[PDB]
Symmetry: D2
Subunit: 43 residues, 4 copies
Amino acid sequence: SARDIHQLEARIDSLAARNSKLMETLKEARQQLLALREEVDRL
Amino acid sequence: SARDIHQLEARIDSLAARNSKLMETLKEARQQLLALREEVDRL
Amino acid sequence: SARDIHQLEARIDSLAARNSKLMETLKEARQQLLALREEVDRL
Amino acid sequence: SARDIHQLEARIDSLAARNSKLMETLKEARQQLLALREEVDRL
């Protein structure tokens, strides 16, 4: 069943890649929100 | 000040685009987790 | 072995619960961003 | 109008709090995915 384990592994690896994509996208959003809050004060 | 508002709007629009990107990525993660739960069951 | 499976299933279910938590939180953020964009316009 | 800005600030603060909630939840999902990948290998 090495077949079964590498199939489960490929799937977990995929989920882990989407997790990293989510985190990097959230980090950019945090930066933009902070800039938005400074821009609202400059006004 | 049209200047100010159009700059605030550009930033909110960017945040809304990242919000959509996060949601589509999370929808794909849900699909993959569901398939992982069925693959685990099968064995 | 079903011991192994129940442990794997408990972990996947936990990940699925966090996935739902992320999606509901993102849905609230989308609504707030839309209201922010309407508030900016009104001014 | 001072309260135009405090309304906008309140809304941005709320979005930033949801952003932190998303990141914390995602950091927990990453840890659990990593443990799942180790548990699958134990098999």
